[PDB]
Design an enzyme around this catalytic site. Structure first.
Site, PDB file in Angstrom:
ATOM      1  N   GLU G 204       0.850  -1.165   0.000  1.00 27.35           N
ATOM      2  CA  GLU G 204       0.000   0.000   0.000  1.00 27.35           C
ATOM      3  C   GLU G 204       0.865   1.186   0.000  1.00 27.35           C
ATOM      4  O   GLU G 204       1.016   1.822   1.016  1.00 27.35           O
ATOM      5  CB  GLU G 204      -0.930  -0.005   1.233  1.00 27.35           C
ATOM      6  CG  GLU G 204      -1.950   1.115   1.286  1.00 27.35           C
ATOM      7  CD  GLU G 204      -2.694   1.250  -0.028  1.00 27.35           C
ATOM      8  OE1 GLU G 204      -3.381   0.268  -0.424  1.00 27.35           O
ATOM      9  OE2 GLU G 204      -2.576   2.317  -0.681  1.00 27.35           O
ATOM     10  N   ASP G 205       1.519   1.434  -1.113  1.00 24.68           N
ATOM     11  CA  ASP G 205       2.195   2.713  -1.292  1.00 24.68           C
ATOM     12  C   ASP G 205       3.299   2.993  -0.277  1.00 24.68           C
ATOM     13  O   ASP G 205       3.391   4.107   0.218  1.00 24.68           O
ATOM     14  CB  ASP G 205       1.178   3.862  -1.210  1.00 24.68           C
ATOM     15  CG  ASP G 205      -0.026   3.681  -2.163  1.00 24.68           C
ATOM     16  OD1 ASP G 205       0.132   3.072  -3.256  1.00 24.68           O
ATOM     17  OD2 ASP G 205      -1.138   4.174  -1.820  1.00 24.68           O
TER      18      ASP G 205
END
Ligand SMILES: [Mg+2]
Ligand SMILES: [Mg+2]
Ligand SMILES: [Zn+2]
Ligand SMILES: [Zn+2]
Lengths: 528, 275, 73, 40, 117, 46, 490, 67, 98, 49
Positions: G204-205
């Site tokens: 997630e990023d």
């Protein structure tokens, strides 16, 4: 004026009485941490030491608390203050001999947070009730709030640097109330749309389908390693699916340990695979693309978003109704831990390789594009002769615009369908789409096959100039490229017109995102 | 114990900087851990404390302290004579747990001066210097053999400081690395299918995959296990390659022995279900 | 309780009273008895805002008017 | 020197064009818009 | 800085203790070993040495979270042979096997190279 | 004890140990610099 | 048209347009029209010839320039109103192709298509393999990537400045960057990056980072904050003074220690300061006597208003400058230097706007290694690629791989005939790697190979101003707003 | 500004090889080969030295024969 | 002082004839990185009502080709109202029509 | 004398324009700075188009 000070935002009622700034709060960046439970949150030592909670001294905890006063403030697990029943509050930094300050039942001691106090954790703008939930702190090194990855979904957090707000309740009554009501395990199925508000996501989501495939076999040595991570293991290692030549456990088998031996889901299987509506029923090759759970054991079929995800009928949802939130909570942590570690030997990746295809596919696609372009010239030639014959519910211009759009959409869809088929099993890109992790069929179409007709306001690129879209085109050119079709794909680059036309359509998405946040914020407010 | 698998060694190539070898009949976990030890656990001497008297360079203070840390130190002398700073009875530092370095330079000439390791000298006797121009320039000239430009100075600029080198290891800070790098490979023909190639023809055969020279690409064996690990450790210059590996093996031996002595101490008192 | 001025230390007569700005509390060096009525240069509270739109300063509640050149303000 | 008569090969590899483009930035500022207006 | 001193990654505290042994309750003749201030480097090799022994029913280790240097080893053996003895033998044998590797290496190094100094 | 005050662009000390104007004599510049302390500071090379 | 190209009418300041369907001709000579340079094509050929190109190369000792080139009348400036009327050709190639193509009427020609890009969209490589909103996101993050921003930053006292230790010029460049002096002054680092899932700390990023790299100085940077303080008569019976404040005389008594100050009233370069130390001791003598009847004792004659921390845990005082300001008053600036080492929470981005937080860092031991042993400096999660479709991220990377082996800087010009996919992959195989970048990776914890090969190779990355220690925050009691009785803003 | 001692990625000291590289390119134009003669066999090291920028020189250039 | 005031504050006019019509025309030059400085000097701004006017003066009109950078706006609030010149772009300083 | 007009940096009236790289480097003003911005009260102030 006095009225103005009272008025609206930052006014005495709305911006101040109805919503004031509070004490006992912390705020920092977030990072993901698989190793936490779901309802845990990691808190930096600096934030945990600076904030405080008031314990009241009882006869049977006095000795521990007296030790806490003795640790002072200079070291972490200490106390900030001591409050006398008389009403006196006393600092624990200035006094030269804390030992001389003997405690007694009735004093309150304001100690630093420690591993196990409950906090309200929050991400604004707070869209729905599940956006603000109670968690257990867990104190660890470096300065962000660390929170289990599956909690991202209710919160909408993308550890791309998003902030969170933390709030620490002070009395035992607010701690009990948060612990009973607001806690994350209580938040699992949402009353908004009676579905699980949080499902397995990102790598764990990709790594699990890949893990549940019946081609995967593990040696005794690697099975022990996964078993080692599992929390609620019984202590009995399950009978290997293959006894000889060498002992082997199947992927589905080891997975049957991580679910609570009771959940009983049938169906939920709908990956693209198998067939649409009746193919497996022709002969009953009982198949492997359809999932079956009996007696808390995964019998056949691989997992995805349809089985494992936020869908109302999942393993997580059925388990929640059946086993109850505390067992579902050990199940969430366990599923990620066994599945992250197995991924650790396996790996997952995506290079340019997953986006390139074969020579024959490109010739077929280009030949598909050449047919569609020829047909558009055919519609234009038919149109200029004034023989097109308008459709019964449109004007001649509208019929033409409908008809070319039908053909150019039809073209993209044929070449798009062609690339998904031309791809093999090993394409990591297909592994991310199929599990339901990220992206979609149309994404695959765009990187490898062809990007297609850009759009604005629901129609093809406007004539910004007099009867042209860019100065580069001839006047009144109604073909594909001139009105903003992108013939190439993001793997092969775009031509300058396509890049600029692509840029027009990307912008419409930025303006919509900026406006939307305001009106929804306002419409929501009127309703409550 | 009946299960100990002998573990043989063969040395292929040795130079001033490289050591290339094969370990055979041992476990993969031994291979990985011995490699992990070569990076993290091998002790060495490196600059660790720097105090700056006057710094007029066109580079700020911590920048200088940092560059000094990273220069490698000829620890040919058994770093075991030099004890860890934590253990020694002395207050702060001493000759018995430290080496001392000193640097004083100024640019009096009109042309630009370079600051290098030759100007930085060990107050401690010449047995533990910087890597540049000591035991020899090796007929293989590095034109200036300057080791490192620490900084540059002009007319009027000057740099006066002190530095204290100490023993520490790689799993603490990267400066305490005896390795520039370490190559590691096992089963170069993928007989065991621990990696699974789609379209196996597009992979370039490795330096050890040459056995069947055959373009058939990977003959399978299902009853195999790891065997014959290929290493190639290269020194950073701070210590001769074979001496790093021998120190690693022994230090790891001290480390396990310590775990045994702790474990024995646990059963010195109450038996704690020892049998 | 009109004899405030900062000599309000009940247990022993005070010599100095210290301001722990960060804690928002008034502390006494040689015992332990906060006596809060936290002035944090109260002057600081109007100057709290900054990140919200300003320059023109809509939230201003008073012009300096330079009084030390004028009898009237 | 140019003559538009003895010339027989007017073509030229537009990878040459950066030499034209460089002469733009090399002469113009990168931010003339500001400067020319104040000078005017 | 919120970050720890870098030495805290391996250095034992004056109050902490290097190993602790606690028995399981789920299954008979099983034990769980906790080593404090350690990494995959010790844990991974010892886990493998215990698996090599045919009298070990189960052996495995994990580190619960990377920011808090600690490892646990679960071992289970037949009900006639203690997991403590197997753990002792696996280590002593490993020291011996490493020492053989060490001895064989120096002798290999000696062989004709006059540049070993 | 003096406070040195290294001058703008000639860097001759001005021995300003009083309430005199911070103008450096001889050199027309009037911006200063306090000079590094003789006090020692420790840096770990890390 | 003939006069304007002949210089008898001021070319840059005069636009001239004919609108033939309304039989009118408007000409504008006003200020504020946006116009661009274009080539003049005549008789369906370029008017610019190779003779001019050799004349332009000649300028290393010749006085011939761009202005001479315009005077040759081979280029004109064309504003947006006039750009409505021209028949502009994309390239000389198309203008040749015309013998089969639909149009043979061109009047102007593009000097190059990537020029439609502004400054920030020009730092970014292969922008057309980017899904279009990614290009907007980078152009923003590009302003936030810190670097060495002018070269004379040692004698500037910008209120707040961020400088990186070791910038590097982008291994894969866009041609345009040769004119942004970007090579002279870079923004990030050429990092070794792998797209893998690893131990999933980078979902997630976020990113998994090599701790030994942050240690060898990688992305290490310095941070300077400058404080300024003024003395000021500011009234008829008020005086401000730099002094060493004492509890014997001054009125402020803030528990912050004043011991670190010099006798003058502000600390000297090299001292360490912290989140309590006083940097400058100023005092405001105020009442002179307006409290009659023995109101002296102490803390009387003057109040304290000195400037000290609240800010942060900070670093070392770099520079202290005493001078006088525009008013004549004695005025100070003091610069405080800090060294930020990349740590969990800091934010970075590649040039495709792949921005992200650092999820955890691992020492060189754990990182998954290659045959050589090249352990990645960053691991980006593969899932960042498919929904976001920055394929340019992968192409930059593959191209950067070829550049590192060849030792020749590559070329990420957004519009060329360099058939980038096939041609680069062919070059990369010739150097002896898997032609499409994968490398057989090994697992750091157990030594076993990773079963899927990992796309690994270099990519230019950026460190951002948003360090994590700047944004952290917390409260317990603290200051109260007595005009409102609630806590302060932040 | 000024070469990082040791390559970020691997550990191989790379300040010892800097000036020699600049000298060799001034003498001999074959930058790929120049890196090879220097001995940086591997591409992490090659980007290090290859893509570095010597900014120190503009800084030395300033009047500062004073600070 | 009248010019010095206008440049310093950002306000417009001598204050007597309003100031709100040309707010924020003047700014402190951002310098975070050399590209940042260079970008601010090339900034172009576009006047609007304030906080929520949705219409055509916000998206990418076709005439921008070659004048204003196609892809480079702030990511929020003024998501298309703040434009930048491309590279080749110019602005005529004006001249006597005589 | 009627007033003082702010000068935009390195335009034809800002004295830096007539000097070369070595001279600006000697003045302690960076040669690679773009200019075109006013300086008011110690701050560089740039106009938005
Ligand atoms: Mg989000
Ligand atoms: Mg997300
Ligand atoms: Zn010692
Ligand atoms: Zn390398």
């Amino acid at each position: 004026s006095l009225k103005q000070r009272l008025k609206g935002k930052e006014g005495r009622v709305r911006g101040n009485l109805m919503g004031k700034r509070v004490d006992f709060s912390a705020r920092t960046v977030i990072t993901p941490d698989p190793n936490l439970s779901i309802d845990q949150v990691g808190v930096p030592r600096s934030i945990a030491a600076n904030m405080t909670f008031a314990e009241i001294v009882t006869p049977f905890n006095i000795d521990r608390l007296q030790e806490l006063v003795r640790r002072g403030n200079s070291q972490y697990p200490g106390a900030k203050y001591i409050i006398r029943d008389n009403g006196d509050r006393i600092d624990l930094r200035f006094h030269p001999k804390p030992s001389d300050l003997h405690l007694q039942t009735g004093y309150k001691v304001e100690r630093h947070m420690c591993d196990g106090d409950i906090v309200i954790f929050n991400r604004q703008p707070t869209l729905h009730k599940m956006s603000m939930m109670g968690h257990r702190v867990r104190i660890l090194p470096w300065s962000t709030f660390r929170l289990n990855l599956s909690v991202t979904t209710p919160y909408n957090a993308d550890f791309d640097g998003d902030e969170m707000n933390l709030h620490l309740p002070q009395s035992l009554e607010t701690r009990a109330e948060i612990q009973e009501l607001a806690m994350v395990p209580r938040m699992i199925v949402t009353p908004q749309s009676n579905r699980p508000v949080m499902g397995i996501v990102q790598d764990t989501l990709t790594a699990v389908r890949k893990f549940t495939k019946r081609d995967v076999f593990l040696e005794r040595g690697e099975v022990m390693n996964l078993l080692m991570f599992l929390s609620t293991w019984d202590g009995k290692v399950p009978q290997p699916a293959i006894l000889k030549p060498r002992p082997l456990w199947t992927g589905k088998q080891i997975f049957s340990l991580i679910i609570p031996g009771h959940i009983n889901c049938i169906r939920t299987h709908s990956t693209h695979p198998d067939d649409e509506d009746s193919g497996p029923y022709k002969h009953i090759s009982p198949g492997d693309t359809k999932v079956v759970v009996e007696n808390g054991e995964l019998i056949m079929g691989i997992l995805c978003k349809k089985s494992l995800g936020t869908s109302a009928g999942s393993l997580v949802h059925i388990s929640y109704l059946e086993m109850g939130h505390d067992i579902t909570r050990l199940f969430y942590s366990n599923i990620q831990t066994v599945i992250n570690n197995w991924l650790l030997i396996e790996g997952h990746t995506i290079g340019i390789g997953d986006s390139i295809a074969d020579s024959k596919t490109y010739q077929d696609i280009q030949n598909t594009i050449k047919k569609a372009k020829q047909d558009v010239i055919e519609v234009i030639e038919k149109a200029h002769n004034n023989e097109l014959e308008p459709t019964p519910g449109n004007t001649l211009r509208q019929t033409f615009e409908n008809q070319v759009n039908r053909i150019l959409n039809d073209a993209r869809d044929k070449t798009g369908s062609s690339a998904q088929k031309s791809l093999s099993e090993y394409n990591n890109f297909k592994s991310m789409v199929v599990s339901g992790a990220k992206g979609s069929k149309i994404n695959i179409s765009q990187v490898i096959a062809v990007v297609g007709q850009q759009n604005v306001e629901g129609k093809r690129i406007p004539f910004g100039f007099k009867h042209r879209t860019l100065p580069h085109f001839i006047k009144d050119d109604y073909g594909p490229e001139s009105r903003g079709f992108v013939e190439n794909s993001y793997l092969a680059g775009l031509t300058p017109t396509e890049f600029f036309f692509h840029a027009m359509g990307g912008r419409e998405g930025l303006i919509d995102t900026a406006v939307k946040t305001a009106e929804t914020g306002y419409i929501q407010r009127r309703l409550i | 114990m009946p299960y100990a698998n002998q573990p043989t060694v063969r040395i292929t190539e040795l130079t001033d900087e490289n050591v290339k070898f094969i370990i055979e009949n041992t476990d993969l976990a031994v291979a990985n851990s011995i490699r992990r030890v070569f990076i993290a656990e091998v002790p060495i001497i490196a600059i660790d404390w720097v105090q700056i008297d006057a710094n007029s360079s066109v580079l700020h203070d911590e920048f200088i302290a940092h560059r000094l840390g990273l220069i490698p130190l000829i620890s040919d002398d058994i770093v075991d004579k030099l004890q860890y700073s934590r253990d020694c009875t002395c207050e702060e530092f001493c000759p018995e747990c430290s080496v001392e370095f000193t640097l004083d330079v100024r640019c009096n000439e009109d042309q630009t001066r370079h600051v290098t390791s030759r100007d930085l000298i060990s107050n401690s006797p010449r047995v533990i210097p910087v890597t540049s121009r000591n035991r020899d320039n090796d007929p293989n000239d590095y034109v200036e053999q300057d080791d490192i430009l620490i900084v540059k100075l002009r007319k009027g600029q000057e740099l006066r400081l002190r530095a204290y080198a100490k023993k520490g290891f790689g799993k603490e800070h990267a400066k305490w690395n005896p390795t520039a790098g370490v190559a590691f490979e096992y089963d170069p023909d993928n007989a065991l299918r621990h990696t699974v190639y789609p379209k196996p023809e597009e992979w370039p055969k490795s330096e050890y995959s040459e056995l069947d020279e055959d373009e058939s690409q990977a003959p399978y064996d299902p009853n195999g296990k790891p065997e014959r690990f290929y290493y190639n450790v290269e020194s950073c210059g701070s210590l001769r390659p074979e001496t790093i590996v021998l120190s690693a093996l022994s230090g790891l031996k001290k480390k396990l022995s310590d775990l045994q002595t702790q474990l024995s101490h646990e059963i010195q008192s109450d038996v704690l279900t020892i049998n | 309780l009109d004899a405030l001025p900062r000599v309000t230390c009940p247990n022993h007569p005070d010599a100095i009273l210290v301001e722990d700005y960060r804690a928002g509390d008034m502390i006494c060096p040689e015992c332990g008895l906060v006596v809060g009525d936290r002035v944090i240069d109260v002057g600081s509270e109007w100057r709290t805002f900054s990140n919200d739109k300003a320059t023109k300063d809509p939230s201003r509640v008073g012009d300096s008017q330079n009084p030390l050149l004028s009898d009237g303000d | 020197y140019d003559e538009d008569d003895d010339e027989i090969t007017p073509d030229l590899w537009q990878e040459a064009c950066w030499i034209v483009i460089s002469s733009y930035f090399d002469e113009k500022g990168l931010v003339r818009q500001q400067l020319d207006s104040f000078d005017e | 800085m919120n970050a720890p001193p870098a030495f805290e990654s391996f250095l034992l505290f004056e109050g902490e203790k290097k190993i602790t042994i606690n028995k399981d309750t789920k299954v008979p003749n099983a034990c769980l070993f906790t080593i404090n201030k350690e990494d995959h480097t010790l844990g991974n090799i010892i886990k493998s040495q215990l698996l090599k022994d045919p009298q070990v029913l189960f052996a495995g280790y994990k580190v619960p979270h990377p920011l808090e240097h600690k490892i646990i080893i679960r071992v289970q053996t037949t009900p006639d042979y203690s997991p403590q003895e197997a753990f002792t033998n696996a280590i002593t044998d490993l020291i011996s096997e490493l020492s053989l590797l060490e001895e064989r290496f120096r002798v290999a190094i000696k062989d004709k190279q006059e540049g070993i100094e | 004890q003096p406070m040195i005050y290294i001058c703008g662009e000639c860097h001759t000390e001005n021995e300003i140990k009083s309430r005199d104007p911070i103008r450096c004599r001889e050199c027309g510049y009037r911006i200063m610099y306090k000079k590094r302390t003789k006090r020692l500071v420790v840096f770990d090379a890390r | 048209r003939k006069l304007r190209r002949q210089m008898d009418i001021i070319v840059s300041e005069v636009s001239m347009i004919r609108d033939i369907r309304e039989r009118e001709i408007r000409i504008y000579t006003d200020a504020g029209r946006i116009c661009r340079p274009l080539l003049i094509v005549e008789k369906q050929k370029l008017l610019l010839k190779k003779r001019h190109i050799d004349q332009l190369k000649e300028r290393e000792y010749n006085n011939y320039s761009w202005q001479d080139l315009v005077a040759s009348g081979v280029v004109e400036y064309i504003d947006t109103l006039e750009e409505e009327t021209v028949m502009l050709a994309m390239t000389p190639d198309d203008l040749q192709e015309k013998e089969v193509a639909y149009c043979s009427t061109y009047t102007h020609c593009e000097i190059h298509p990537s020029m439609i890009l502004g400054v920030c969209a020009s730092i970014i490589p292969f922008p057309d393999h980017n899904q279009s909103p990614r290009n907007t996101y980078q152009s923003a993050m590009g302003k936030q990537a810190m670097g060495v921003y002018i070269t004379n930053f040692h004698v500037r006292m910008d209120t707040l400045a961020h400088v990186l230790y070791y910038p590097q010029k982008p291994l894969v460049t866009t041609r345009s960057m040769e004119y942004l002096r970007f090579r002279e002054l870079p923004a990030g680092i050429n990092s070794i990056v792998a797209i893998a899932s690893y131990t999933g700390y980078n979902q997630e990023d976020s990113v998994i980072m090599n701790r030994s790299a942050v240690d060898r100085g990688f992305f290490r940077s310095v941070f300077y904050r400058s404080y300024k303080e003024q003395e000021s008569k500011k009234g008829f019976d008020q005086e401000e003074v730099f002094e060493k404040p004492t509890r014997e005389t001054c009125q402020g008594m803030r528990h912050a220690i004043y011991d670190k100050l010099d006798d003058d009233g502000l600390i000297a370069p090299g001292v360490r300061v912290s989140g309590d130390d006083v940097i400058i001791g100023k005092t405001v003598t105020l009442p002179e006597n307006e409290d009659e009847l023995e109101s002296t004792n102490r803390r009387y004659t003057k109040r304290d208003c000195s400037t000290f921390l609240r800010t942060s845990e900070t670093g070392i005082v770099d520079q202290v400058m005493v001078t006088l300001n525009q008013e004549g008053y004695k005025f100070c600036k003091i610069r405080v230097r800090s060294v930020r080492i990349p740590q969990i929470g800091d934010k970075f981005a590649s040039r495709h706007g792949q921005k992200g937080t650092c999820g955890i860092q691992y020492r060189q031991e754990d990182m998954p290694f290659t045959c050589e042993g090249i352990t990645p400096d960053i691991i980006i999660n593969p899932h960042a690629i498919p929904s976001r479709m920055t394929i340019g991220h992968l192409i930059e990377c593959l191209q950067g791989k070829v550049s590192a082996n060849k030792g020749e800087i590559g070329d990420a010009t957004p519009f060329n005939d360099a058939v980038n996919v096939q041609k680069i992959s062919n070059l990369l195989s010739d150097y002896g790697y898997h032609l499409r970048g994968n490398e057989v990776l090994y697992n750091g914890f157990t030594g076993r190979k990773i079963t899927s090969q990992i796309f690994i190779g270099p990519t230019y990355y950026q460190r951002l101003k948003h360090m994590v220690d700047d944004k952290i925050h917390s409260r317990a009691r603290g200051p109260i707003q007595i005009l409102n009785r609630q806590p302060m803003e932040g | 500004m000024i070469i990082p001692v040791r390559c970020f990625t691997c550990g191989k000291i790379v300040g010892n090889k800097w000036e020699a590289y600049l000298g060799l390119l001034q003498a001999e134009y074959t930058e790929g080969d120049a890196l090879d003669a220097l001995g940086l066999k591997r591409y992490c090291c090659r980007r290090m030295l290859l893509a570095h920028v010597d900014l120190i020189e503009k800084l030395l250039n300033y009047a500062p024969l004073e600070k | 002082d009248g010019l010095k005031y206008s440049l310093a504050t950002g306000n417009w006019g001598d204050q007597k004839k309003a100031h709100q019509a040309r707010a924020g025309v003047s700014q402190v030059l951002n310098r975070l990185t050399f590209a940042s400085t260079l970008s601010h000097l090339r900034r172009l701004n576009s006047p609007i009502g304030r906080d929520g006017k949705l219409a055509k003066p916000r998206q990418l009109h076709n005439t921008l080709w070659g004048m204003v950078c196609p892809a480079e706006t702030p990511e929020g609030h003024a998501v298309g109202l703040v434009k930048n010149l491309a590279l080749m772009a110019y602005i005529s300083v004006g001249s006597q029509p005589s | 004398f009627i007033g003082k007009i702010p000068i935009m940096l390195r335009s034809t009236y800002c004295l830096l324009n007539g000097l070369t790289d070595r001279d600006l480097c000697e003045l302690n003003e960076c040669p690679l700075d773009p200019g075109g911005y006013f300086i008011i009260n110690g701050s560089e102030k740039v106009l938005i188009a």
